Amino acid sequence: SLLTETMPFKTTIEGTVNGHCFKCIGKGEGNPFEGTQEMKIEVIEGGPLPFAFHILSTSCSKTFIKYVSGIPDYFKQSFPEGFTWERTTTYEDGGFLTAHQDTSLDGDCLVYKVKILGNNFPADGPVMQNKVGRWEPGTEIVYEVDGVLRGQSLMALKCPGGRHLTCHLHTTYRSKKPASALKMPGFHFEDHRIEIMEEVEKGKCYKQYEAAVGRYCDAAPSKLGHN
Amino acid sequence: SLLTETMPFKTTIEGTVNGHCFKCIGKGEGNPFEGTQEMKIEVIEGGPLPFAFHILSTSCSKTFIKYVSGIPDYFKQSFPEGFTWERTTTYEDGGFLTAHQDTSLDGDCLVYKVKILGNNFPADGPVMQNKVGRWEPGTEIVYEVDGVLRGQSLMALKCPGGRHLTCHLHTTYRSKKPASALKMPGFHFEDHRIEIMEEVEKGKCYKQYEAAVGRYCDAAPSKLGHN
Amino acid sequence: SLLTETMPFKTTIEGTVNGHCFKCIGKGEGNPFEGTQEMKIEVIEGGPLPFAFHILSTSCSKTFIKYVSGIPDYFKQSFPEGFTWERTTTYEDGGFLTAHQDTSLDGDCLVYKVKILGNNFPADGPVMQNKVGRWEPGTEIVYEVDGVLRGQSLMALKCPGGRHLTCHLHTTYRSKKPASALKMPGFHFEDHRIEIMEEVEKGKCYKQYEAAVGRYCDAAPSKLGHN
Amino acid sequence: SLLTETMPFKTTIEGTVNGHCFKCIGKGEGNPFEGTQEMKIEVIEGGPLPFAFHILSTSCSKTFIKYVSGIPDYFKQSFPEGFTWERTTTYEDGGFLTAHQDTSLDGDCLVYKVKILGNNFPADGPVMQNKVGRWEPGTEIVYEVDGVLRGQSLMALKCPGGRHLTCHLHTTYRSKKPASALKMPGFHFEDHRIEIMEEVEKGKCYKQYEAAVGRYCDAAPSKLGHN
Numbered sequence: 001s002l003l004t005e006t007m008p009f010k011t012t013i014e015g016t017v018n019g020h021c022f023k024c025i026g027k028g029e030g031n032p033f034e035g036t037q038e039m040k041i042e043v044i045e046g047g048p049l050p051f052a053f054h055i056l057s058t059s060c061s062k063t064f065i066k067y068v069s070g071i072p073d074y075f076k077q078s079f080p081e082g083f084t085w086e087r088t089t090t091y092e093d094g095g096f097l098t099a100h101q102d103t104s105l106d107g108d109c110l111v112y113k114v115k116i117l118g119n120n121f122p123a124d125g126p127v128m129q130n131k132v133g134r135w136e137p138g139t140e141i142v143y144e145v146d147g148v149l150r151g152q153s154l155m156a157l158k159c160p161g162g163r164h165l166t167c168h169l170h171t172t173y174r175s176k177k178p179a180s181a182l183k184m185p186g187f188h189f190e191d192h193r194i195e196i197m198e199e200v201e202k203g204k205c206y207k208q209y210e211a212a213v214g215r216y217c218d219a220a221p222s223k224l225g226h227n
Numbered sequence: 228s229l230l231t232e233t234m235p236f237k238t239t240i241e242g243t244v245n246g247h248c249f250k251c252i253g254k255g256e257g258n259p260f261e262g263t264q265e266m267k268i269e270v271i272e273g274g275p276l277p278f279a280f281h282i283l284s285t286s287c288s289k290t291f292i293k294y295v296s297g298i299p300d301y302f303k304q305s306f307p308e309g310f311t312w313e314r315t316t317t318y319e320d321g322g323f324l325t326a327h328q329d330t331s332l333d334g335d336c337l338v339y340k341v342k343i344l345g346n347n348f349p350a351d352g353p354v355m356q357n358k359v360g361r362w363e364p365g366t367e368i369v370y371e372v373d374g375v376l377r378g379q380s381l382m383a384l385k386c387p388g389g390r391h392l393t394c395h396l397h398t399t400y401r402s403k404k405p406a407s408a409l410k411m412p413g414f415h416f417e418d419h420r421i422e423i424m425e426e427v428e429k430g431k432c433y434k435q436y437e438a439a440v441g442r443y444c445d446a447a448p449s450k451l452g453h454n
Numbered sequence: 455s456l457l458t459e460t461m462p463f464k465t466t467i468e469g470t471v472n473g474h475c476f477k478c479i480g481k482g483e484g485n486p487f488e489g490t491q492e493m494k495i496e497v498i499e500g501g502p503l504p505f506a507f508h509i510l511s512t513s514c515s516k517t518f519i520k521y522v523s524g525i526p527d528y529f530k531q532s533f534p535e536g537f538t539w540e541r542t543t544t545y546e547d548g549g550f551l552t553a554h555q556d557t558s559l560d561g562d563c564l565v566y567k568v569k570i571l572g573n574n575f576p577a578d579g580p581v582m583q584n585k586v587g588r589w590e591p592g593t594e595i596v597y598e599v600d601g602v603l604r605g606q607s608l609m610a611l612k613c614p615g616g617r618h619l620t621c622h623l624h625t626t627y628r629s630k631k632p633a634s635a636l637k638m639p640g641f642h643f644e645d646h647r648i649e650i651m652e653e654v655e656k657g658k659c660y661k662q663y664e665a666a667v668g669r670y671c672d673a674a675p676s677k678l679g680h681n
Numbered sequence: 682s683l684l685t686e687t688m689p690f691k692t693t694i695e696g697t698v699n700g701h702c703f704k705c706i707g708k709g710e711g712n713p714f715e716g717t718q719e720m721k722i723e724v725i726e727g728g729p730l731p732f733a734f735h736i737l738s739t740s741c742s743k744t745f746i747k748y749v750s751g752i753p754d755y756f757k758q759s760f761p762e763g764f765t766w767e768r769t770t771t772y773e774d775g776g777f778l779t780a781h782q783d784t785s786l787d788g789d790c791l792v793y794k795v796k797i798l799g800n801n802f803p804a805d806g807p808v809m810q811n812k813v814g815r816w817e818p819g820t821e822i823v824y825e826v827d828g829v830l831r832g833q834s835l836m837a838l839k840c841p842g843g844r845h846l847t848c849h850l851h852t853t854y855r856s857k858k859p860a861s862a863l864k865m866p867g868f869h870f871e872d873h874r875i876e877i878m879e880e881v882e883k884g885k886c887y888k889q890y891e892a893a894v895g896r897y898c899d900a901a902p903s904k905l906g907h908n
Contacts, residue, residue: 154834217874
């Protein structure tokens with residue numbers, strides 16, 4: 001493939017959350033086929049962020065997923081044309097985090113352009129108070145709809161006091177390559193384990209890691225030969 | 228006030244809905260105190276729109292509301308500083324329309340800057356198929372939270388076949404003037420009657436009217452003297 | 455009509471909320487055509503209730519609504535056959551209150567049979583802590599779907615600390631009379647002002663009043679002659 | 682334990698969905714420690730069901746889960762006292778299915794008592810039209826809250842035409858044994874693979890199988906030693 005064992009990627013992020021404008025830049029690399037990656041995000045405008053960086057964790061990279069059981073790779077198949085994704089994450093305490101992202105292959109490096117609009121986060125909530133813990137790993141269900149791919153997941157942000165702030169992700173993935181030229185994957189799961197490796201600079205620079213896997217429900221046996 | 232019986236307003240809109248980028252410009256005028264207004268919106272990029280213009284109707288103007296029963300006017304009080312609003316509208320069939328808007332008073336004219344991110348609209352739904360009818364009037368509940376104003380409403384888009392595509396609006400209004408310098412209104416209702424007066428150019432130019440009123444539930448009598 | 459200027463009604467309620475079983479009985483009367491009513495509810499089992507009685511306020515009477523502007527009365531038309539309604543109320547903090555009710559005319563008295571299932575209310579929330587204030591009046595949108603009537607509303611429970619615990623009601627009203635024999639009302643609003651007149655016995659007996667009105671959006675003028 | 686390699690269980694179900702009352706009885710057995718089970722459900726009242734039996738699949742058994750990685754078993758620990766669960770499942774097309782269930786150990790057999798209230802299912806939807814396919818396996822996130830256990834999952838019902846009708850389950854599990862006497866499990870996943878083995882009698886008798894596993898996200902490696 002046009003993807004190397006160690007693919008580098010750059011990102012530019014622009015957004016407004018609860019009326020606060022900000023801008024980020026980031027760089028990282030990962031193993032596309034092993035489904036691992038890491039990057040450093042830098043807030044170049046509006047820093048230090050007045051909210052937990054974590055609500056941006058999923059907006060910083062679907063090319064880095066390890067697909068097992070022969071599941072087709074919608075993202076890797078999309079190159080060199082690339083793809084885009086759109087999503088609205090709804091938090092159980094009222095917040096909404098909407099994002100649109102464009103993924104392209106510029107030479108030997110992947111390029112992400114991200115637009116973000118977040119709102120309604122409670123001023124007294126863990127996010128705006130910036131008192132969150134970490135993301136538990138999340139499992140997304142991905143299936144074909146309208147010729148494109150749809151995904152949904154429930155994620156849980158561990159917060160101090162033994163609390164879990166959950167949210168619901170509603171995603172749509174669009175290949176820039178015609179559906180006719182793609183091998184659409186069937187209904188499957190996509191585990192995403194996100195971990196902030198280091199807070200290089202409070203509210204201004206973070207190092208984030210993610211391991212992802214595309215699989216079927218291997219734990220529970222089927223009696224009718226279903227995936 | 229710095230608002231005249233006939234206030235003019237200009238708007239610039241930029242957004243992406245279901246992966247489709249677009250840009251609009253608009254101009255209109257209304258009677259701030261009578262709560263009526265009308266404007267012409269023009270799609271200057273990405274036209275003709277591949278979706279019903281109606282999902283943008285609420286993103287094109289809170290300065291034009293007629294407040295009765297002595298309810299404080301959070302928006303008019305905000306000038307000359309101005310204000311902003313953020314919102315995520317969730318549709319019953321899966322679509323999300325997120326918007327952020329900035330309202331300012333530039334001389335004798337109001338200026339709106341709008342950012343929009345919409346996604347997950349079903350390809351076969353009334354919106355993407357562009358087969359909608361009109362908006363029924365909508366009633367929003369507005370109340371103070373976190374020192375700012377929050378609003379929610381359920382709106383219904385009449386569609387062919389006697390169908391009603393409903394959605395839930397989640398809004399936050401932020402004055403650019405300190406809360407200390409504002410007279411916060413109590414819990415009340417805000418009726419918004421939106422009507423597209425003319426489709427000047429299919430998917431490219433529209434004339435929209437809106438009449439709004441800030442009131443209490445006058446129809447049902449209280450026994451404890453509640454608003 | 456078979457309804458008198460002063461109609462009496464009896465109710466029996468059975469339910470489980472957050473694992474707590476309870477049973478109620480109630481009696482009251484109201485003016486069907488004036489849209490006013492009042493009743494005394496008595497918890498005969500599982501009392502005193504370990505949660506705010508208010509989450510049961512809407513489950514205790516659609517026959518008592520004052521319809522204006524010539525809007526057809528789906529409920530009064532349903533007699534003597536009667537009708538039923540089903541609803542799930544979702545609270546912004548995670549609670550769900552589901553109810554099914556049967557309305558019948560037994561002689562000169564209306565009879566309500568109610569089944570309730572509530573769950574997921576946060577133990578530390580206003581409802582389970584039983585620290586709520588009162589319901590603001592609520593406006594429901596009612597429209598025809600699938601030959602029956604559907605309704606939705608956003609309600610707000612004022613709570614101490616200047617807080618508003620909101621919820622979303624999802625209702626379906628089914629006449630026991632064939633749709634062919636009914637005059638289906640068009641899209642309209644139904645204001646419901648609920649007020650607990652007296653806490654006769656803490657967590658065991660309450661007196662509740664409600665004034666309701668079926669109307670169109672009279673506050674905001676239409677330019678196309680729409681209701 | 683008081684649980685045998687082959688545990689039998691009986692169930693009684695009572696409910697109303699979209700105004701349709703029904704009653705069921707069922708019997709089955711499974712391997713508690715292997716997390717497999719199967720039962721035959723019989724509609725004794727209101728049959729044949731006017732809706733897809735599948736919306737009742739999750740209301741027919743948490744004692745049959747195979748926990749790996751040393752995750753504590755909240756359900757098996759609850760005996761002989763037993764436990765209960767409450768849930769509201771929200772469908773993407775508007776339907777709600779609410780249930781309350783009581784689990785007890787009566788001798789050598791498990792006994793389930795289930796109450797169900799479903800409503801708002803579109804008359805033209807896959808459920809009321811009874812044109813559904815099968816459930817994809819579902820992954821639930823389970824975590825401690827308020828001293829009890831909470832769970833959430835997104836499930837997908839495959840339907841003809843390559844469609845996926847998804848829903849969101851909101852659950853609360855309550856042991857009848859004091860929390861102090863229980864070993865609360867940490868945040869984990871619970872895969873549930875439900876399969877209808879046979880439609881013994883259309884809309885009146887079904888054979889359902891389920892394999893379940895309590896686990897951590899083993900597919901994606903952690904860098905900080907997280908489960």
